[PDB]
Design an enzyme around this catalytic site. Sequence first.
Site, PDB file in Angstrom:
ATOM      1  N   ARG A  10      -2.103  13.623   4.265  1.00 54.72           N
ATOM      2  CA  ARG A  10      -2.883  12.455   4.660  1.00 54.72           C
ATOM      3  C   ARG A  10      -3.004  12.400   6.173  1.00 54.72           C
ATOM      4  O   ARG A  10      -2.109  12.844   6.900  1.00 54.72           O
ATOM      5  CB  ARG A  10      -2.214  11.163   4.170  1.00 54.72           C
ATOM      6  CG  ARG A  10      -0.950  10.795   4.952  1.00 54.72           C
ATOM      7  CD  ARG A  10      -0.270   9.530   4.450  1.00 54.72           C
ATOM      8  NE  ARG A  10       0.932   9.247   5.235  1.00 54.72           N
ATOM      9  CZ  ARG A  10       2.096   9.879   5.088  1.00 54.72           C
ATOM     10  NH1 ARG A  10       2.230  10.832   4.174  1.00 54.72           N
ATOM     11  NH2 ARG A  10       3.127   9.561   5.858  1.00 54.72           N
ATOM     12  N   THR A  63     -18.074   9.430  -0.448  1.00 53.14           N
ATOM     13  CA  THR A  63     -16.750  10.004  -0.650  1.00 53.14           C
ATOM     14  C   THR A  63     -16.948  11.509  -0.654  1.00 53.14           C
ATOM     15  O   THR A  63     -17.393  12.082  -1.647  1.00 53.14           O
ATOM     16  CB  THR A  63     -16.115   9.574  -1.988  1.00 53.14           C
ATOM     17  OG1 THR A  63     -15.998   8.152  -2.036  1.00 53.14           O
ATOM     18  CG2 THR A  63     -14.735  10.193  -2.152  1.00 53.14           C
ATOM     19  N   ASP A  83     -18.572   3.587  15.367  1.00 54.75           N
ATOM     20  CA  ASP A  83     -19.523   3.674  14.262  1.00 54.75           C
ATOM     21  C   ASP A  83     -19.347   2.450  13.347  1.00 54.75           C
ATOM     22  O   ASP A  83     -18.738   1.458  13.749  1.00 54.75           O
ATOM     23  CB  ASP A  83     -19.329   4.981  13.493  1.00 54.75           C
ATOM     24  CG  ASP A  83     -17.879   5.263  13.193  1.00 54.75           C
ATOM     25  OD1 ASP A  83     -17.136   4.298  12.919  1.00 54.75           O
ATOM     26  OD2 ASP A  83     -17.474   6.444  13.246  1.00 54.75           O
ATOM     27  N   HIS A 128       0.844  -1.192   0.000  1.00 52.68           N
ATOM     28  CA  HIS A 128       0.000   0.000   0.000  1.00 52.68           C
ATOM     29  C   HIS A 128       0.882   1.246   0.000  1.00 52.68           C
ATOM     30  O   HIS A 128       0.769   2.103  -0.877  1.00 52.68           O
ATOM     31  CB  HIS A 128      -0.905  -0.008   1.233  1.00 52.68           C
ATOM     32  CG  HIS A 128      -1.599   1.294   1.492  1.00 52.68           C
ATOM     33  ND1 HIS A 128      -2.657   1.740   0.728  1.00 52.68           N
ATOM     34  CD2 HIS A 128      -1.392   2.243   2.435  1.00 52.68           C
ATOM     35  CE1 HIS A 128      -3.069   2.907   1.187  1.00 52.68           C
ATOM     36  NE2 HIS A 128      -2.315   3.237   2.220  1.00 52.68           N
TER      37      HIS A 128
END
Lengths: 237, 239, 235, 235, 239
Positions: free
Chosen positions: A172, A220, A181, A159
């Site tokens: 980031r 998104t 959640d 990744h």
Amino acid sequence: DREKLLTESGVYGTFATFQMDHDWWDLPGESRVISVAEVKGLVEQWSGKILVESYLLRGLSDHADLMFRVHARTLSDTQQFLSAFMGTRLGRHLTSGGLLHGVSKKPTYVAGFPESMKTELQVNGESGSRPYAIVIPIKKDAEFWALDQEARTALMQEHTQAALPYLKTVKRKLYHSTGLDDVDFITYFETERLEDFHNLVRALQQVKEFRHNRRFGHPTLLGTMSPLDEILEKFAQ
Amino acid sequence: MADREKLLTESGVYGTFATFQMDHDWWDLPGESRVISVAEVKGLVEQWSGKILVESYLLRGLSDHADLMFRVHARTLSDTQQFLSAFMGTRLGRHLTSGGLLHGVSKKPTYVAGFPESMKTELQVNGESGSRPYAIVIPIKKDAEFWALDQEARTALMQEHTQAALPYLKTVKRKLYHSTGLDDVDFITYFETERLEDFHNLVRALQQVKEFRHNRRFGHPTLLGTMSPLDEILEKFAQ
Amino acid sequence: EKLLTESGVYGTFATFQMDHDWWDLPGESRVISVAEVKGLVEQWSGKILVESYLLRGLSDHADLMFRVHARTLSDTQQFLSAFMGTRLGRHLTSGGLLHGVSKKPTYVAGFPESMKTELQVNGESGSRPYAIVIPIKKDAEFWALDQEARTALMQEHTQAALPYLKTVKRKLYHSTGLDDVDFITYFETERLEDFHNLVRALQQVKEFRHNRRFGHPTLLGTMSPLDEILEKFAQ
Amino acid sequence: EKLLTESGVYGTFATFQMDHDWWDLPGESRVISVAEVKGLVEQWSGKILVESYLLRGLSDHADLMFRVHARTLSDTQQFLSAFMGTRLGRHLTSGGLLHGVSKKPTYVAGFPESMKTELQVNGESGSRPYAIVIPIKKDAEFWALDQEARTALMQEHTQAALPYLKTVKRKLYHSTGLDDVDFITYFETERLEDFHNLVRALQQVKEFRHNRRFGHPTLLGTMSPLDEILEKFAQ
Amino acid sequence: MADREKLLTESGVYGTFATFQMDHDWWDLPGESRVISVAEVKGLVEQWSGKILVESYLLRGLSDHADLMFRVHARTLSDTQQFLSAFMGTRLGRHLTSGGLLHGVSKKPTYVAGFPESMKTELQVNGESGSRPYAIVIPIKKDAEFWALDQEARTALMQEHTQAALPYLKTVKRKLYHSTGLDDVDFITYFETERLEDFHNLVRALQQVKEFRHNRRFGHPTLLGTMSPLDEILEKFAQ
Ligand code: HEM
Ligand code: HEM
Ligand code: HEM
Ligand code: HEM
Ligand code: HEM
Ligand SMILES: [C-]#N
Ligand SMILES: [C-]#N
Ligand SMILES: [C-]#N
Ligand SMILES: [C-]#N
Ligand SMILES: [C-]#N
């Protein structure tokens, strides 16, 4: 202490989105200017205990006008702030969009990466004002958790590898959301170049790890980062 | 004086989780009218304090599309129905959109007996001594696979489940309601904790055992809130 | 047009639906509102390109769509935030909203030379054509494939579509990372039965089964100047 | 009576929720509205059978449910359209709506004679019992099985449920083609803990895994005369 | 007088299914105002009586969240667009929330030619002679597998499909619209019948053939309604 909240561990991060009702414009201009003033004041009132940043989703994300990124050392404070905000005259004309929380934690897999990779990971982002912002919630499949530490460290090194070329033009941050959640992660990105960010995601779509994302996005959230005054200003005139 | 604690811990006791969301027009009511409404409700709960136990949670600002949640214990659900119907009748209740609603019986353990004796011992501790703790509710539905298994198999999975959770017995209170046939979930899990960061870790731990993949439905919604007396919650709606 | 054909140009699809209380407004108020918008569009006509589609009566829960081209999405944001700010916009429920950059072809180079030639033809000479928008998300399998594998899949995709190369204009936007889809496809045509056949044809190739999301929504509308659409909202 | 047990009798399950703006109405107007409905129901009680359930406080987003039996759906449509036409009906947002015919047993004949015997008992001695309604859709596999195979599945199903034949009444409606489910199951009981066990028991048989849709919604309510239910909305 | 049936039986004719639901505020209108509104629509439809065919269905009380449905035939969808836009514009239309909207081309048979001659004969029969029949609409999407199949394979599946349905050609009228590319389904099926119990059995029969498992989407929604003239439907909205 923006410095402290934006980078430390143990700092809860909350993403709350809102959409403006129609009947808000049925209110006279005067009532609306007062409402904006109330909120700006409330946020300034809380600036001691928590950090609050604003994003204009209006015109970039469907069914969303405004987003707050709230940092706090306890979610209770974040709760108190959000409940108040939603109470104000402005808050009463907002339909609550998504609401997601996640704690910032110390890296889990970076230690098992090559020393040369750790070096490159020192860089996070660029020097930019009013950058685009993207928020992508994530849920891993059961398989991902079943993997052993070595396996996941390998997936993450792959990744990381794919993402290195965008390490500069894309800021980031990762929030650990499991149990607060319905997602495992909340990812947050700032960038001045969306075309880079687009390419960054296609690159990551091709690594092995990706197929373990049972949930990727939805929503998104794409928006422009801006001071709260300039955002609410649009809802006053 | 009052054995209220029985409902909160005994078996055969139905437990109900009802969430509500406040309409926008609730603030069109004058501030004074709203405070009166609070008293109406506070009295109603007290009127029922004989038949049922009621606890309150502020979900506003932590859980999406939900402001208030009641955890209602009652020895029959008709009673919970009457109270909840009455609650929705009060002036305040008339300005509440009914959110999620889930029921489940609290029962005596099914798998704990087949565990090692050292494990049974540790399970006696349930939670901490804490006031105004966070509260979490996670509905769960098991897949068809899970039910096809035999008792021994499941007893093994749950023993693995328990083992994974052991480091958290103190910092997280727990209760399990058996919900099958009363709604679209099999279990309702309920947790109190002062450290969510622990609870987060508790869930990552459980995500890695075998049992986990048999959860056809896990959360959806995952209700996060603060536990608090009813007065302080309703007070917030009178500004 | 520079924007309509060059690469690096963001393309945005924004849908809207008219509220009921919009017709509670007096006739005068409706026509003045129309004027506000027409001005706003011309006000932006320098920075961005904006095209309009009447979805009313062809697409569920949608009356109007804008296709906005711009070299930055910020501009598109500003325009859309403004549009929704006008008196008309205040009576519009935001529908679907999707962005995607136009990019340089990725697979066409690896096609036969005879195929590259034919792809120069894009569409017909038509006014007020139907328009269709179909968002697409590929599955994880598709991305794992190697360039040759994908270059092959797309060549079969292209092959199936060649007989419709004339009667169906096409444009592809690369949408990954700006929303919950990978591509936004856009097509203009005077013959929908042709477009229908084009899609049934494409449904039979290999590539297709890798479309995890296909449509949802499938936006169908007629292309038209902004004036004529809003006119219907002046009754 | 006549309708509840014969075959060819359509059964319809309609749920409703009371709007907020209903309490903005003055107390008198509400009682007048209540009176209106009670009359409409008695007006139809000749042609069709209608029963009431208080879902308020047991099922989310539902206050009231009707179970309507009729030898034709035309009649049920007329009643339901009328009900929603009433002053009160105009303040109800329609929840779920499901239909299903009551049919003669399909698999019971191939069961043991001793099992056929026990199935003669249907329910308990109860007034104002709880009621549960569970829609069901089978997967493609289930239909692919042959009659002998399914008969085995049902026998395993029947077997698992035998201990609850007394404390749980049951009725089955065949819903395929009238909506998006294959079966509507309906149960009355005074002990939910028994019903809970009945469902946990049935979850362990083979057949269960063939339920592509199970519940959604699982409607739980208390059975009651319409008068006492509407009374709560007249305060 | 009028070759209306051109649209109902020809190929190349678009067919559109539009559903509507009545707003609450529609009853705030005075009785007289509502009847005039009905007259407006009846006129608009008659105004269009040249270009298109329009048929009406009462979904209220049989289909969830839907009161009215139009089946509109047209040689181009623009006409249907203009008509529906006008309809939604009328005083009545302004108080209707638009439900589902689906389009589909009527085409000449693709697989019927490869069937036995005895089967083609039976397929000449379409429906019964009935007035005010029930009507059902089921959108359908096939899976990728189905398209991957070759013509011979699909023809076999359809012959099995047809075979299962043969016992119902009398009691169930049918029509198939090819919807791919105009929306999120591949087919729109439409049925008229006086016996729903027959239609019910017809669907269980089709559920047992091989073809069926390739239906990625089946129904959702399954629209059930009664066929009736537009006035009598609208008449109900005037009392
Ligand atoms: C320049 C860009 C990026 C870099 C350098 C990067 C690097 C990393 C690293 C090093 C980790 C794990 C470190 C640790 O926990 O010890 C991680 C985790 C993660 N990243 Fe990224 N990443 C980037 C972009 C992205 C993007 C675009 C996404 C889009 C969804 C994403 C999603 C995630 C997720 C969900 C995790 C959690 C995995 C886990 O820790 O178990 N990242 N990233
Ligand atoms: C300190 C934390 C925990 C401990 C000590 C614990 C322990 C146990 C034990 C011993 C049982 C078996 C009791 C019985 O039914 O006989 C059980 C059941 C169960 N637990 Fe937990 N658990 C913990 C946390 C959790 C969490 C965090 C979840 C989900 C979010 C969860 C979900 C469940 C479910 C669904 C069952 C029912 C299994 C069944 O009866 O079929 N538990 N737990
Ligand atoms: C006359 C009609 C069409 C023609 C000539 C055509 C041709 C092509 C060509 C040559 C490409 C390669 C682009 C590249 O190399 O970057 C492509 C890509 C693509 N097409 Fe089409 N196409 C047609 C219709 C359609 C339709 C109707 C759809 C969907 C409903 C569609 C979906 C896509 C998608 C999603 C891609 C991008 C694949 C990727 O880059 O990974 N196309 N098309
Ligand atoms: C005392 C409890 C029960 C008994 C005695 C019982 C018995 C039966 C029997 C004998 C049949 C076959 C009828 C026939 O031959 O046509 C049947 C069908 C069916 N039952 Fe039950 N049942 C019980 C409870 C339940 C429950 C609790 C559910 C669901 C939660 C359920 C779901 C179904 C379904 C979906 C069918 C239709 C199967 C088919 O015809 O393909 N039943 N039941
Ligand atoms: C008496 C009832 C029925 C008869 C005689 C019948 C017969 C047929 C025939 C002969 C075809 C082939 C048409 C062609 O060549 O294009 C066909 C296609 C089709 N039928 Fe039916 N059918 C009946 C009922 C149904 C029902 C109840 C459904 C769905 C609920 C259905 C779904 C379909 C679909 C989706 C196709 C198109 C398949 C394709 O072209 O790939 N049919 N039917
Ligand atoms: C990855 N942040
Ligand atoms: C575990 N409750
Ligand atoms: C294909 N564009
Ligand atoms: C079994 N009904
Ligand atoms: C077959 N329609």
